[PDB]
Amino acid sequence: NIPMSDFVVNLDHGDPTAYEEYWRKMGDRCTVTIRGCDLMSYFSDMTNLCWFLEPELEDAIKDLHGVVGNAATEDRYIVVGTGSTQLCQAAVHALSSLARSQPVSVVAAAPFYSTYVEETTYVRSGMYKWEGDAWGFDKKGPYIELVTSPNNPDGTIRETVVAKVIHDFAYYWPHYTPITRRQDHDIMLFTFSKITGHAGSRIGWALVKDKEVAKKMVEYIIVNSIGVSKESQVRTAKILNVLKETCKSESESENFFKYGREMMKNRWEKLREVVKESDAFTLPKYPEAFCNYFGKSLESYPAFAWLGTKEETDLVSELRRHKVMSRAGERCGSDKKHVRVSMLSREDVFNVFLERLANMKLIK
Amino acid sequence: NKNIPMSDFVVNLDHGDPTAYEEYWRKMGDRCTVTIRGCDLMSYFSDMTNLCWFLEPELEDAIKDLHGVVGNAATEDRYIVVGTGSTQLCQAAVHALSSLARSQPVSVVAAAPFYSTYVEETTYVRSGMYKWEGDAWGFDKKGPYIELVTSPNNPDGTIRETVVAKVIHDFAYYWPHYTPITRRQDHDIMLFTFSKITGHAGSRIGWALVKDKEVAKKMVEYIIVNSIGVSKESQVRTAKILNVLKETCKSESESENFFKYGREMMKNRWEKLREVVKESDAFTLPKYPEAFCNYFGKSLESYPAFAWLGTKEETDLVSELRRHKVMSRAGERCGSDKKHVRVSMLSREDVFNVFLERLANMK
Incomplete structure (x- = not known):
């Protein structure tokens, strides 16, 4: 009733x-x-920088970006994380860890993804500091700019507005926005949650060029949680694979x-x-x-x-x-x-x- | 080859x-x-009815049943919090306790020898909320502090107790196949890891039993900002394994x-x-x-x-x-x-x- x-x-x-x-x-x-x-086992492959990365997942990521053509994956390291949320914090951590002086400034063009603020505030780390809006940011010293594109909340296609950068391409997929170019920046973040909707899997991956950065990110994840759930990786790989087969179907519901x-x-x-x-x-x-x-x-x-x-x-x-x-x-x-x-x-x-x-x- | x-x-x-x-x-x-x-x-959510809304019911039940049959830990009148391994929970407890402390940095110590990994967990992020002071034995510094008690201890395997004000109990190896279950643990913060019980370390699953709701709430929050929860499929699998393990307890076969x-x-x-x-x-x-x-x-x-x-x-x-x-x-x-x-x-x-x-x- x-x-x-x-x-x-x-x-x-x-x-x-x-x-x-x-x-x-x-x-x-x-x-x-x-x-x-x-x-x-704790380990997946000691032959990789990110040893907690399941092979089948690594292939599924590369094949997917290969078919969609939205991200470059050659000559770079893939780092898996319990979601893009842990990957972003790993990158901020790494970039700050390699900076020449701390705290490193972290900024994002307004309006920005609100969750960024707490992520760079809750532990009270002296390695970095949230400086808010990037528009007009001109503080001196090392800084990290967060570029979300499509943006959260406005969905605007974005670029740097102001020295390191992190690209959050959570929504940069065909069903959300058109693929104008195969992205190829230094640190590109992607989440399994917003592609297929399997948010409960807590799985994200980062494409990193600078080996020294990727190395620090893996180290961060190791201390933070010693890796990512294997079953999550194994599953994410399965459905991403099904999603790939789906890309050559002509049915509209397929x-x-x-x-x-x-x-x-x-x-x-x-x-x-x-x-x-x-x-x-x-x-x-x-x-x-x-x-x-x-x-x-x-x-x-x-x-x-x-x-x-x-x-x-x-x-x-x-x-x-x-x-x-x-x-x-x-x-x-x-x-x-x-x-x-x-x-x-x-x-x-x-x-x-x-x-x-x-x-x-027209009613309250 | x-x-x-x-x-x-x-x-x-x-x-x-x-x-x-x-x-x-x-x-x-x-x-x-x-x-x-x-x-x-x-979905990101498992049950909004729980303080820890990302905790899958069937895992919660399994944890309680397992502790109920083993009798190594108390689970009544306390919140259960899951995390990507005990390692994440432990950091959630240190964070939470420091957040609620009257002043920071809160001193963090552990009787020597101690679990080496504790040192990097309380240092890698350079947080002003707490500070690793080292050996708990020679600890006379003042103000707020947190003592880590591992029992059986890593590395020496000694049964421990507080030696020096908050405390976190790491009962990673407090199971019948490692050490005798002398008492049904009932402290404020008790940590357990699926890894060392059955060997399923790749699942990244640990849980904490917390009496103080304020601490539990802050721990959950920490995990929310840290990784928005824990892998569902892991929780579901951990639960499956822990159930089989429980059934196994009534078996007579020594291989079963x-x-x-x-x-x-x-x-x-x-x-x-x-x-x-x-x-x-x-x-x-x-x-x-x-x-x-x-x-x-x-x-x-x-x-x-x-x-x-x-x-x-x-x-x-x-x-x-x-x-x-x-x-x-x-x-x-x-x-x-x-x-x-x-x-x-x-x-x-x-x-x-x-x-x-x-x-x-x-x-």
Whole structure:
């Protein structure tokens, strides 16, 4: 009997549950089987810089970036981590450890991924210091710039605005944004969580050129948790493989990236409608670009909607009093007029959100 | 492959990779098999009903059942926190306790000899929240402090207690196959690792039992920023293994009952090592008192997972040992002297035997 108006829509976080249906249909081809004596050792391969990296995972990463053409993997080291979240902290750690003086400054162009702030603050390390907005940053000494592209929260394609750099390409995949170029920077971060939605696997990988950096990152991960879950690696490798086979299918419900784009496209079009006829809501505009993967020129459909409001309201609060959770813009170095709303929730959750989005400022 | 002389073969007992249990689990067969569907464990969340919302219920239940049957730890009226290995939990506890402290840096110490890895865990990030002060024995510094108690201790395998205000208990090896279960542990922070129990170190799974909710909450938070939780598939597998292990406890077969198989294994290995050392003229091995184990209901010995090897001479034991192609952990790294080394007893059979051969045949 639970009246559906008492139902809280939580789109504050970025739990990519939207892909759950898809993978369920994939069926038994995604199944992972692990014997009782498998993956027991601490080590995977002492022949690699990152010895805790499972071989099958290393191949799956390389093949995937090879087919999608979104990242260069030659002449560099791959480092696996319990998610991109532990890989970023490993890189900040390493770069700071190699700097000529500490604390090293860490900055990011505003608006930025709010989680960056705590990551560079919670342990109170003298190795580095969060300096906020990179725009206009001109403090002296060593610094690390965090470039998220597509960005979190606004989904903007980005580049350095201001000396080391870390590129977080969590959302740099065909179903989110067009592949304008095969990235090839010094430190490129990727997460398994936002590609297929298997966030619970806690798996990310970093592509590092500087061997001395990669070496320190591996060392960081070793002390921090002595490696990453083997079963997670073994599984991530399995589905990424299935996702690769899927890239040569012509079915629209088979080819993941195709399916993904369309799903993202539809949701963004519906949201676009609602915002259109609403009185005070705004939505970021994204330029069209050519995608080297799909071979066409097409729109971007970010995993987060940077919702704004022309009014002088605490949008997060207003949205909250209509039972809609979202990420405060002030947390992303923005203002009370913006909020970040996940676009990767479940279908019914998404629909309910749109309903209330319109039903509001025209009912309270 | 052949033509490689066995004399060029490096015996690495520097690390504590518990590969000795691999044989056992292989024989257990298909009942250990873990199956994961493509659409399972996708969300970041396991259960928002729990303080530690990233803890998978079936793992939580397994941990409690296992402690319930072994009786080595209390689990009532306390929060359970999982982490990517005990190593992550331990750092979560040190962080949490320092966060709640009235002033920083909080002093961190451990009676010598101590688990060398503790030194890097409380140093690598250069945190102003705490400071590694070293040996707990000679600790007279003031203000807030945290003492680390490992029992059975790494490296010497001694049963320990606080010797010097917060405390973290590392009961990595507090299991029937290593040492007798004298009491059902009930301290504020108790750490356990799946790795040293069954040998599944690659799963990266450890858990903490925490009485103070504020500490537990801060520990969870730490893990959230540190890696947003722990691998689901690991939790699911750890749970599967720990269940089988539990069933095994009621078995009579000595090849079936894990704790029976383990202890019998650790016993044999320790006796062969005991012989070798005895007829040696320089090496020394610790002495462990006999005690009554509430699990086995008998009065028996403890056979630690590490051998704290010492020499009466005036040598750099770790050096001489390497000279015979034997890798071990330098006692100096454990806050000891060059006369001691830590040699793992949980390696593979053949590696172990080779070590015994080389050990008796040297000066």
